Amino acid sequence: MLIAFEGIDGSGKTTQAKKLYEYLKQKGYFVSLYREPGGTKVGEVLREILLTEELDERTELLLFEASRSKLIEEKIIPDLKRDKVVILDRFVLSTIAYQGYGKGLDVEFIKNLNEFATRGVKPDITLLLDIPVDIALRRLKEKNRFENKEFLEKVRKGFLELAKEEENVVVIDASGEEEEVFKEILRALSGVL
Amino acid sequence: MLIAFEGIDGSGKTTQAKKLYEYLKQKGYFVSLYREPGGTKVGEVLREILLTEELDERTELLLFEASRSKLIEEKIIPDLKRDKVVILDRFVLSTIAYQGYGKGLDVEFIKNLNEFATRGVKPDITLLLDIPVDIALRRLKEKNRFENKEFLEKVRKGFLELAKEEENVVVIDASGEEEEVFKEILRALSGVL
Numbered sequence: 001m002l003i004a005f006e007g008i009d010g011s012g013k014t015t016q017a018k019k020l021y022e023y024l025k026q027k028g029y030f031v032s033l034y035r036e037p038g039g040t041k042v043g044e045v046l047r048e049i050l051l052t053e054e055l056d057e058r059t060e061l062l063l064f065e066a067s068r069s070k071l072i073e074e075k076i077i078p079d080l081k082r083d084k085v086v087i088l089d090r091f092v093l094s095t096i097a098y099q100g101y102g103k104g105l106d107v108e109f110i111k112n113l114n115e116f117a118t119r120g121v122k123p124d125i126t127l128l129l130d131i132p133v134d135i136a137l138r139r140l141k142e143k144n145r146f147e148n149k150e151f152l153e154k155v156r157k158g159f160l161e162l163a164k165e166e167e168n169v170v171v172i173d174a175s176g177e178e179e180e181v182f183k184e185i186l187r188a189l190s191g192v193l
Numbered sequence: 194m195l196i197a198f199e200g201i202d203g204s205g206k207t208t209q210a211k212k213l214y215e216y217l218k219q220k221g222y223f224v225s226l227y228r229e230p231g232g233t234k235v236g237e238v239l240r241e242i243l244l245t246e247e248l249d250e251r252t253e254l255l256l257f258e259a260s261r262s263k264l265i266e267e268k269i270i271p272d273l274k275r276d277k278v279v280i281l282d283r284f285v286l287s288t289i290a291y292q293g294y295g296k297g298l299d300v301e302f303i304k305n306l307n308e309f310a311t312r313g314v315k316p317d318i319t320l321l322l323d324i325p326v327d328i329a330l331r332r333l334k335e336k337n338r339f340e341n342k343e344f345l346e347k348v349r350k351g352f353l354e355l356a357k358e359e360e361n362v363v364v365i366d367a368s369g370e371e372e373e374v375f376k377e378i379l380r381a382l383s384g385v386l
């Protein structure tokens with residue numbers, strides 16, 4: 001079982017993925033939680049680079065994918081083999097939305113890089129935490145983090161276009177309170193688990 | 194002017210590229226010399242990773258391309274804009290030969306990644322330093338470095354198959370002595386410069 005959380009900065013992915021992890025552990029599933037980029041020794045080095053350095057979008061994309069490739073090969077494929085539930089804080093839709101709809105790289109190209117890095121491993125379900133950018137920005141403000149409204153609007157649209165066309169994507173209203181959003185996620189999850 | 198040296202380990206790329214650099218500087222060209230992977234701050238971090246860590250071939254390929262993307266955007270494109278002669282110690286044929294023919298990844302795929310990382314920037318000439326693996330291994334032995342014969346035989350064949358099909362590739366007999374090889378390179382170079 002592979003569960004992917006996707007969405008803009010401040011949509012509650014980290015929080016909700018952690019909530020889903022504890023909940024499922026208590027219910028007796030063997031669970032892993034990983035973030036992208038990151039999740040491996042090598043992946044975390046690349047994460048530090050992606051956050052530290054001034055990078056063009058192409059170099060950026062290739063490093064996101066490298067982190068994913070390492071994570072898929074080192075952790076996710078074996079995790080899935082042992083019937084672990086695998087929960088991802090960001091995955092392949094994030095790459096398309098940010099690098100494609102956001103920074104203007106070719107979407108078919110991103111998709112083929114995604115296919116390559118994941119060896120065609122796809123989620124059973126993707127949870128799109130959709131939220132107005134204004135609301136996501138106010139939440140980040142409370143944590144002293146400031147993101148680009150213009151850029152996130154395009155990204156958000158991207159994410160929503162991808163949910164119409166890509167398979168097994170459920171749009172969750174992430175604008176609610178923490179517990180409301182979690183119980184919307186559980187209903188979407190009841191579909192598959 | 195973009196000049197690329199390609200070929201197996203111990204073929205004399207580093208030595209000949211450095212020789213070509215000093216020669217052209219003396220003749221009054223403005224010259225850059227860069228290695229792949231490496232050549233930028235970020236590229237060299239990735240280099241250290243690629244030489245340090247146990248990596249699957251997919252992750253490897255994506256990090257080789259990330260380095261290249263950084264080098265293209267940070268150094269090569271602007272170097273070419275200012276009419277510098279740019280000399281590369283390894284470039285895009287090496288990727289195909291090592292990751293494609295060597296480790297079995299798809300060659301069309303590597304070529305499309307190459308296209309992406311370089312923004313379609315192609316060399317004016319590529320110098321393939323071809324050498325028998327037995328001879329390259331004897332040279333590396335003198336420096337206490339030991340590489341995999343079985344792997345390099347495939348890689349060498351790959352390099353040679355690419356020189357037949359890809360554009361502007363000259364096969365230099367790298368088995369000769371240092372000064373003989375340099376003379377052959379200068380002849381090949383007279384074609385374009």
Ligand SMILES: Nc1ncnc2c1ncn2[C@@H]1O[C@H](COP(=O)(O)OP(=O)(O)OP(=O)(O)O)[C@@H](O)[C@H]1O
Nearest residue numbers: 008009010011012013014015139143176177178181
């Ligand atoms: N339903 C909610 N209502 C209000 N605030 C929330 C809700 N869920 C999470 N938060 C808080 O708002 C912020 C959301 O951040 P979180 O890290 O969960 O989102 P994220 O999508 O992981 O962001 P990023 O991509 O930037 O890491 C946090 O400070 C979190 O504690």
Ligand SMILES: Nc1ncnc2c1ncn2[C@@H]1O[C@H](COP(=O)(O)OP(=O)(O)OP(=O)(O)O)[C@@H](O)[C@H]1O
Nearest residue numbers: 201202203204205206207208209332336369370371
């Ligand atoms: N023509 C030659 N004959 C004998 N030895 C040589 C010749 N040219 C270079 N060498 C030596 O052989 C080794 C291989 O040269 P060099 O480092 O340039 O090859 P390379 O293709 O860069 O190898 P690598 O990819 O492993 O760095 C060096 O230690 C060098 O001193």
Ligand SMILES: Nc1ccn([C@@H]2O[C@H](COP(=O)(O)O)[C@@H](O)[C@H]2O)c(=O)n1
Nearest residue numbers: 009035036037064090094095096098099
């Ligand atoms: N495909 C992706 C995924 C994440 N990111 C960025 O990575 C940063 C930190 O990641 P987290 O959201 O996982 O903490 C975010 O600010 C986000 O904008 C990106 O630019 N492209």
Ligand SMILES: Nc1ccn([C@@H]2O[C@H](COP(=O)(O)O)[C@@H](O)[C@H]2O)c(=O)n1
Nearest residue numbers: 202228229230257283287288289291292
């Ligand atoms: N595409 C590439 C390029 C270099 N390499 C490796 O990089 C290493 C460093 O050698 P250089 O000095 O030629 O960069 C070599 O051991 C070579 O086999 C690889 O595996 N795939």
Ligand SMILES: [Mg+2]
Nearest residue numbers: 013014015089
């Ligand atoms: Mg987060």
Ligand SMILES: [Mg+2]
Nearest residue numbers: 206207208282
């Ligand atoms: Mg060398």
